[PDB]
Ligand binder design. Structure first.
Ligand SMILES: O=C(CO)[C@@H](O)[C@H](O)[C@H](O)COP(=O)(O)O
Ligand SMILES: O=C(CO)[C@@H](O)[C@H](O)[C@H](O)COP(=O)(O)O
Ligand SMILES: O=C(CO)[C@@H](O)[C@H](O)[C@H](O)COP(=O)(O)O
Ligand SMILES: O=C(CO)[C@@H](O)[C@H](O)[C@H](O)COP(=O)(O)O
Ligand SMILES: O=C(CO)[C@@H](O)[C@H](O)[C@H](O)COP(=O)(O)O
Ligand SMILES: [Mg+2]
Ligand SMILES: [Mg+2]
Ligand SMILES: [Mg+2]
Ligand SMILES: [Mg+2]
Ligand SMILES: [Mg+2]
Ligand SMILES: [Mg+2]
Ligand SMILES: [Mg+2]
Ligand SMILES: [Mg+2]
Ligand SMILES: [Mg+2]
Ligand SMILES: [Mg+2]
Lengths: 385, 385, 385, 385, 385
């Protein structure tokens, strides 16, 4: 049977600040999706946060870009906002709900969507990722590695079934143009684009052999505001797609990503454990953001699908081998924070979410550099006097 | 609505020694404040310890320096002392209750108070800190960093709303004089004072733009005895005040503070997790003090206020990034302990809580240095013989 | 009131091997002491293991060397042995029960005893230690440091009340002679003795000011067999005796001790956490011994006494500062194990519990060195041929 | 007497690649300046490289922007290029000599100039810095710290003579505008600018008390090509200007700078020792650039001036305390290199010296994102087929 | 024969700043002492610096406090100052020469003296230490350890000849009183004094058995200015005095000392190698001070005396085992520097060499704390307006 797997994610209020969510928000959302499942709107679901972002993972058979599934998520986030976030005056209450009225598609209204529809395989392992305090381009490096780096994914070399490579759908979120690039042959052009992680973002990946969907990352064109929102990512694994371990090895170097405090810094992406995972209640509580509102973290939950039911989730960063990677991230976060307000720890001026540069340039007197050069002595004496 | 948030803290007995508190003390205190809330004396509360210090965090609408709120805390500490501490003969039972009679204000009677009154914001995130085995000046470095160091708080540079800086109310606890200093322009004079952490202590911070209260640290003038008592600190966060993460980044270097064993040493301030946090029972059990009666530790609990109700607490040092900072603190504590009884690990002689210097100078014969110089040979032969 | 605090400890069976105890043994022992308390034989108790050693900590008013208290422990160990250890065929079942008949004093029959009687102070904090896989002399270094090293115990310098020092009762377990040495003046003679940790063992420490008992270590003269048994130690803290933190700082360097595999090696003494502590059930489950049957570990439980009741225990090695000390111990255990069967990792030949040296010397032909020297060529050709 | 100190620096050929210089280039330059000194054009000189950049440090009394001193440097670089670099076909031979004809001022022709004129003090300590594989903005963080960060420069707090702060002359190298900002009061506006290290660069610093020149960094407006060239920096120290140690502490965190391979990456600025320093021959040979053409490194040579003579140079990064800082840099260089071609290790697309983005966008077919969305299925089948 | 060994030390100019000395200063001094030796004023000599301090080590038979030997050192420092330091305008030229006229004793005029006279033993090993950027009390911890800590000096326990202990001559440099304390019995009183390292300084140590001089540290009463000057120390070793290795083990923990930048900070004492040692030329060139004008460093040169001739020096910190101790010091220097201007990294306000506190208190308005409390609202609105 064909099944659609959809993650729709929003931040509708933090607890406190942007550090985490209130657990009643997850409880409320899971009860609301349980009602939808009882009415047959969806097959199954799982609700979890990383940081202050709540992901609703739903399986159903309504296809991609479905108004009832997008509406179901919109209504769930709206009811969490009104019943829980506003009641407790949580910080950024209703943050991502950027219009008053659901139009039919949630995309572009602030919440993030990653969805894929496909024929469910004889075994259908999937991993759902959620990252807080970063941008969709944070996943460009991991997605490149797991589908195209032979130092990550051994199947590309030793699995005759993966030898043909993958097709990357890259969105330029500035000029709203899509590029299709095929690895291995296009690897250098692909990297020329997706190295600029705030502009060219991997949105989908397909298998070259048959066109099978292999991953979907939440990204939308930029709007004024919308589009740097913390991402979610779905990846299908095994049987000609990277193994669960190849997918996870792509996160084993905690690379620098853009986001962290005020959406205006670079820090390491720490692969973090969930605080708790309750497969019966369908809820997992992810990690907090603490120093400097981070560092940015990604959680990974694995599932096996059957007739669209989700058995899981399993926390896939829960291994002492990943504690080495967390320790690396914690040490790099301390090193780079000693740079304070300077690039490249602070982001390039086009890329920062916060700036006071207008206020500064309104108050600080400029001198044409040619004129200034003749009168430097006079200008300095003025300041000294 | 206007709300007052008050932390009133005392050590009324340790378990064992000064290492921790007995959990029935927290249970007793929480039941007593639940009774006060049922009678409308306060709105909400949370009870927790770090080390052997119990903090009562209360919200109410009676304003600062209120005799009913101070009396409520005095009576709670007295009843814990008589019903629990004295019954179990805990160490330092009733330690901080330094008179027999409540006068109307608890300040100066040994317990520590940090309180702020303000109009509750549309979202009102706050963090309550408690440190054991140190002095109020332990928070001078973090408070300076979060309100005035652009390497800690990125908002000072990139948040046009914070660009105007902050006003620090500094108490000279020796001569009982208050200084008001404004950053950025007064940063060097401010530091000239608050670097001497046992004399000039930040007591309050206000926002320069509007005068909004931003933090309150527990400190009182010194008395003979009173005033070096382990501190508590309230900080309001976000929206023109430092983000929760900027506040927490100010604790991410575990700097040396005065206190530790016998109130007479310097060691690193470790940002520690709570052992447990129970938002329903309104109780959190903080960390123990072990080697050398420490090292000194600070706990951080975040809340969101609504109509004065406290949703929380959330332990905000609970992140693998802070395990790097705890490991740093544990290594520095071992290094500096190899210095034993010598300055600067032992404190300056004016600053130590314990001394045997009177007993020594009564028993060891002095020689005027001029006279001694002629007869050194004779004095040495005397000792040898 | 005068109270006696007694720890009586035995290994009556391990689970598996010598790695740990079976939890039903602790359950059985705690129920048996609950019966004794109901009959008024003792006031209170706490039962715990470290490794394969079970400590029964009892408070009572029958004094030191009491036959009913020693008999109570003997009967408890015998009933655990017959009902639990022999039933499950645990390893070393009844190991320490070295006669068939209780004579009146358990000392010298294999179990270890540390006891002190004193007037209960207005606050009476005590710490009970238990070490597995080592000998009573393992505590010589910590006991020396906490009572006589000014780099450990700051009170010796800055606490006029501790300035007069301490009296150490040292047992020569070979020639059965007792030495009384007073610090500071006798420190170098004391160390000349107790540096030889398998022969001269600190058995008791008293305060010099008033003769108050301050510590008691389990040690008995050596017998043939008996006396190297894993020790237990009681220390009273505070108020002119070292602070709880000074006692614990004496364990903050994980020094090399004798014991570990086969009672025949040297390894670092790791200060370990308990797996669980249940003050209601009166039971704590201590750490396992794993690589090479260790490394040797010590647990520390703190209590406050009141009318002889034991409020506690509190695990006093439970602090991230001691995780640095555990990591040091884990690294030193790996380094020293690469030495295999050579001194000083293997113990001196008089000091090892296991030897095959008789079997070797019976099978390997000796040559008088003078004779051998003339005929070396001939003897080598013989072996080669 | 008034003296001018001028550093004029160029890369006229590397050995091999951009890794180092050929030692005969330094020999040639030192002999040429010895001839100039004999003819009285300059007072004294010192010639050194860091990486593939040669600095000519000259003292003289001709003032700033002098055509004979600039011409002397131009002719020296031209003669090194023709006699040495072209003869040995060194890599980038004559790289920085960007016209055929000296116009009168070397600035803007590719070589870098930092110069200051002042009355020589009763003691006149100066430090000359040279960095390879980075841009003038690499010194923005150190210059900010040594003149305005009280965590670097203790004199700002405890030296009543430095309390008044400093005046920073900041050049916008894009729009050719100069800003004058005074610390402490302007610190946050200053940082708002100079955090964008590729656009707003500290060019000079003056003392606020008297207007004394305190530092000069080599920077020129950007041209098409010119202006990101590896910088040189002169700093005067002591007596109301930061101490030599305060200047050096500003380099003790090896922060990330822009440059490294292909002028297109971010890596840590390692404070490196010179390979050799010969005060008699007036030559020092600085460090090589190796992995990934770096990491970027800065050398520091201290001098004392007398009547314009240069006694020195002294390598001021030669201390085991700075080996910790080099080890930190070597570990961060290995961590960040695992990011390969992705921001923020690769620079923002406006900021990179190399790009192939034109070639890519000429070869990779774009799809308008709206059109693509309808036909995704068709486009993927096309690629698969 | 009786011989006197005298170290007389001064800083007469740094190169650059306070980082090092100019090598011609050492050359000049060694030639001047060679002339004195040819004229029979002294027997032998050795000249060396650590940092910006030059030590003249001389052997002779004129006894302690000799005007010709003190005058010889004064004249050597004066001639270095006039011929070398002033000629090159070195920083702090003539710094320690605090009068115009030699009175007969150099002590108290700024230079530091440590001298001992004794019958030369059948073998006479001595070590000369010099520390820069700290105070004479920096040696209190090492001198205590090598003569009184049995964890440093094994001879105190296992050398029947050292069992009787040592006599410490302690100078109170504030009230000008001398204390004589004998270890082991007086260890706790001694530490009560010499833990306050800026007030009670070990000046001499003698052997208890016979009164033999064992060490002499340079310290003088404080004057206004004089007395915190960087110290020098002579220690005799072996044969009932600590072994060379016991002396050196007392420096193997790089403890925190007072001094470093501006004489106003605490940092670790790094045991450093000499850059070069030339026994023929009688010169050694010690280490530089770099970050933050340090960290503070101590050098150790060993000699064997024969008829007063000095065979040596040997650098006794030159061993890979001490590279661990240097790495520890380099890491602690980086940790503690992140504290910036706060105690205990900055010194107590009585103890700092630099302060701007007068200037601050002249400019910052105080409010009596009682009055301020009523009008806080008004004062804050004033600042905000
Ligand atoms: O079982 C193992 C190894 O023994 C796994 O490492 C699989 O080989 C891998 O996950 C690829 O499995 P397929 O996707 O090829 O089935
Ligand atoms: O959401 C993020 C980043 O994406 C946080 O880092 C906030 O930017 C920060 O906490 C300041 O928030 P305000 O106080 O300005 O609302
Ligand atoms: O409270 C503190 C420090 O503030 C403890 O370090 C005690 O000073 C110490 O445990 C000795 O306490 P006494 O035994 O002297 O009562
Ligand atoms: O030779 C060794 C060891 O083999 C040295 O460690 C000496 O034992 C030590 O230096 C004390 O020597 P004395 O001062 O007792 O002669
Ligand atoms: O001598 C020392 C410390 O003893 C140096 O740290 C100087 O204090 C510092 O270099 C500032 O010197 P000035 O610039 O104030 O002269
Ligand atoms: Mg948020
Ligand atoms: Mg988020
Ligand atoms: Mg207490
Ligand atoms: Mg306390
Ligand atoms: Mg056993
Ligand atoms: Mg055992
Ligand atoms: Mg080049
Ligand atoms: Mg270059
Ligand atoms: Mg000097
Ligand atoms: Mg000096």
């Amino acid at each position: 049977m064909r099944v659609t797997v959809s993650i729709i994610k929003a931040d509708v209020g933090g607890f406190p600040g942007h550090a985490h969510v209130h657990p009643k928000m997850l409880e409320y959302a899971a009860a609301k999706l349980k009602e939808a499942q009882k009415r047959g709107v969806i097959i199954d679901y799982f609700v979890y946060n990383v940081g202050d972002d709540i992901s609703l993972l739903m399986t159903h058979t309504k296809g991609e870009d479905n108004k009832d599934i997008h509406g179901l998520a919109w209504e769930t986030f709206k009811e969490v906002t009104d019943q829980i976030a506003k009641r407790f005056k949580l910080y950024g209450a209703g943050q991502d709900l950027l219009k008053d009225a659901f139009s039919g598609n949630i995309r572009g209204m602030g919440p993030q969507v990653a969805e894929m529809e496909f024929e469910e395989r004889p075994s259908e392992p999937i991993i759902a990722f959620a990252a807080d305090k970063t941008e969709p381009g944070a996943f460009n490096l991991p997605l490149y590695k797991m589908f195209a780096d032979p130092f990550t994914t051994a199947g590309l070399v030793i699995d005759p079934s993966m030898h043909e490579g993958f097709i990357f759908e890259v969105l330029d979120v500035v000029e709203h143009k899509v590029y299709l690039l095929k690895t291995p042959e296009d690897a250098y052009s692909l990297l020329g684009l997706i190295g600029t992680t705030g502009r060219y973002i991997i949105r989908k990946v397909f298998r070259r052999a048959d066109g099978a969907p292999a991953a979907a990352n939440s990204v939308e064109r930029l709007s004024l505001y919308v589009g740097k929102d913390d991402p979610v990512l779905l990846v299908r694994a095994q049987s000609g797609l990277p193994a669960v371990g190849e997918v996870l090895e792509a996160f084993a170097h905690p690379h620098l990503v853009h986001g962290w405090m005020r959406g205006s810094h670079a820090g390491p992406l720490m692969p973090a454990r969930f605080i708790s995972v309750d497969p019966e209640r369908r809820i997992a509580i992810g990690p907090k953001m603490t120093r400097f509102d981070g560092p940015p973290k990604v959680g990974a939950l694995g599932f096996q699908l059957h007739e669209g039911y989700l058995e899981g989730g399993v926390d896939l960063f829960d291994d002492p081998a990943f504690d080495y990677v967390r320790q690396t991230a914690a040490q790099i976060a301390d090193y780079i924070r000693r740079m304070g307000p300077f690039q490249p720890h602070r982001l390039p001026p086009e890329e920062m979410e916060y700036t006071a540069l207008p206020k500064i340039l309104a108050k600080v007197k400029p001198y044409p550099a040619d004129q200034y050069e003749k009168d430097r002595k006079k200008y300095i004496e003025a300041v000294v006097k």
